[PDB]
Fold DNA polymerase.
Amino acid sequence: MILDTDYITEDGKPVIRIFKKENGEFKIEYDRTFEPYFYALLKDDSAIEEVKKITAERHGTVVTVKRVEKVQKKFLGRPVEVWKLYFTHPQDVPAIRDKIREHPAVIDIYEYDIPFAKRYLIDKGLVPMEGDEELKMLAFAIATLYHEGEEFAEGPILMISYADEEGARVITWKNVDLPYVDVVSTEREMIKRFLRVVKEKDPDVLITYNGDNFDFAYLKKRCEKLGINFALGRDGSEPKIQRMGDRFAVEVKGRIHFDLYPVIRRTINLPTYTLEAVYEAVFGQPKEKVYAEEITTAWETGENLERVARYSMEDAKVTYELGKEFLPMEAQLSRLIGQSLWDVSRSSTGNLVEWFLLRKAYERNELAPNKPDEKELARRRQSYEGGYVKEPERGLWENIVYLDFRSLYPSIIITHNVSPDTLNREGCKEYDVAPQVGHRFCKDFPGFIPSLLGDLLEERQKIKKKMKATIDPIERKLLDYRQRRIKILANSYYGYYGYARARWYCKECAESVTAWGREYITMTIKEIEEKYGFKVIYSDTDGFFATIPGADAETVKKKAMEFLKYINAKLPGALELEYEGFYKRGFFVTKKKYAVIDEEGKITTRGLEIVRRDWSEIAKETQARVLEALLKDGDVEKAVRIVKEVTEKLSKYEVPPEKLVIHIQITRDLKDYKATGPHVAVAKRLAARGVKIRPGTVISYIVLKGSGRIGDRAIPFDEFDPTKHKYDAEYYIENQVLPAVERILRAFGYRKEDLR
DNA sequence: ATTCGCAGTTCGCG
DNA sequence: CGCGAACTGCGA
C-alpha cells in the first residue's frame, strides 16, 4: 500500500522514494529511472536543434536539455504534435521552462508545473492508499507557556500529550498526581521522551489538530533553542515545514501527518472551529477547555496542574478519536484522486478535480491545458446565469410532495455530452443545442469529462450495490466512503467548468449546464400544473414542492407517482425526476427560507436563521421552537407564547450569556474592509494586541447594553464576564429573536407589538 | 481559491 | 431621515 512519494537527489540525479506498507511492514521503493519532462509546441521542426541548445542556470550550475522525443497527442480531442523535453533534474525545469517559452519559434509549453513525485504517481499509474492495510496511528497535542505580550514560542512547552488505541498519556516536567502522566526532569527531557515514544510506536499516521501552523512548529523552535534534533521522520529526517499560501503545512517523511483542522473545516459547517466545538459536534459528547491564561497561571503557581493535565490528555484523546473517524473517509478520497493522503487532505475542491483530470488526461493521451496566466485570468471575469428560483407561495401548506432530478447537473453533462472537447465541434453528425445560450455539443463521441463522469457514476452504483452484499464490516464501510466520495467529485464538475483558474475551464459548458437545468425544471413545473392540476409551492434549481389544493394525503401521493411515470418517459438520457419525500405540512417564508414536517415528526430546515452561524443560538432556538409548534402541533397561540416567554427572560436577564454569542468569520485582510461591521471592529482591536487576525478566523462576540453603534458595543465573548458587563437585552429582543420569529407569523396577523 | 442565486444586517452618505 | 453599498453565509 503506497502511502506517499517524494524524491531525493543522489549525485545530481533524482531518486523517487515510494513509501509503502506491505502486510504490516514499512518499505521504501527506489526509482532512478524516472525522467523529468515537459512539452513544447513550435511552428517548424527547424527550431528543435535551436531548442535543444538552450541553456539556463539554477545555482552556479548550467542546465541542459537531456534528450528529446516528439509525440502525437490529443488536445481537446484534436490531434497535435508536441516536443517532449526531458531534463537531468526535476528542478531543471522551472529554471529553463520560461527560457524555452520565450523562444519566438515555440508556440507554447505544456505540463510544466507538475511536482515530480506527483507526476510519478500519474505517469506510472500508481494509486495511493489502495489496499486492505491497517495503519498504526498516533495523535498528539502540546501545552505551552504564554505571556500576553510576547512573540512566538519563547515560553516553554509545559507538557506533551499523545493518544492511540491503548490510551492517552501526558508528558510534563513538573509533578502531577495523575496515573496517566509521566514526569521527567526538564522540558528538554520531556521533548526527548516524546521522540522516543514515536520511534517506539512507529505510527504511520501522526494525527494533530492545527499541527500544521502551531503544534508541530513550536516544537522545532524549542528544539532548536534547546539543541535538540527533531528526528521524527522514518528516515531520521526532521519535519518539513512548507509554505501553503497564507498558512503553512508540515510533512513527516515516511509517515502521514494527518492534520484534522483543514479536513474538518472543508468537510463540516460549524459556528466555531476550536477543538472542543468539533468534538462536541461529531460525538455529541461535551469537552471543556482550559484557557491559556489558566494554564500559565496554574504552571507558575503550581495550582491544580491536574486540571491542565486532564485537559491536555483529553486533547490528544479526542484528536485520536476524531482521527479514527475521519482518516478512512480521507483515505478513500486519496484512492479516488490518485494522490497522497497528505496532499489530498489539504486540497480544495478545484485541486482535487484537476489532479483527477490530470491522471485521466495522461491515460487518454490527452495533453493537458495550462493554468491561466494573469491577463488570461482577467478575460475569465465573465459571469453567467445559474439556477432557477421560483418565488414561493408563502405561508403554511399541507400535503406537500417534493420531486427533484437525480443529480441534475451531472445527468445533463453526460446526456448532452457537455464538454470543452465537444463544444461547437465541427464536422460531427449529431449535435445537442443548449437552450437559451445556444451552444452546440458534438455527440458522435463521448466528451473527455462526460466519459469520466459516466464511469464515475457507473462505478458508484457498482460500489453501492456491492456494499449491501458485502459480509465484511470494514470493507463495507470503506465502500460507503468511496461511493459517497465519488458523489462529491461527480457534482464538482459543473462548478469546475466555471472556475476561472481551471485548466479545463469552459464558461460555455457552465452556462450550457445551467441553461438545460432551467428548462428541465420549468418544463416539469408546467406539465405537473397544466396536465395534473398540481400547485407548485416552491421550486429551487433542481426540484419543486407541489400539492393539489383540496386533496387527501393519499391522493396527492399517488397522483404524484403517476406524474413521475409520465415525465420520465419524456425525460431524455439519464435525466430522471424522483419522489424525494412527502411532508404533512410546510412553511415557506420566502426564497431559500422554508421548513417542512414529514410523517415521522422530523422537521427539515433550509436557509432559516436556525441554520445560520452568524445568528445567536437563542433566536435559532426560539425560531425552532415556534417552527415546531405550528409544524408539529399547529398551535399558533402556543408559538406567540414561547416568543412572549423568551422576550421576558431576555428583559429580566435570566437568559444565559453563551446563548447570546454571534459568530462571524473574517473573510480577508482587515486593512481591505471598506465597511466596518461589529465582527470587524472586535477583530480590529484584538489585532491591536498580541492576537493576529487571519482570514477565516471566527469572531464570537456579544453585544452589550450601551450607547452607540453595535460595533462599538461588541466585545469578544471570552473577555465578557457579568461583573462589569450587562448584555443588551433589547438588541437580542429587537434585532435578533423577534426579526427571525417575525418572518413566519406575520401570515397569522401577528406583529412584534403582539410579542413584547 | 467550484459556481450562481439570494435574504438580511450593519453601517454610512445625501 | 431613507437608501444603498458593504458584508456574510446560505441552498442548490
Notes: Chain A has five domains: 1-130+348-368, 131-347, 369-446+500-585, 447-499, 586-756.
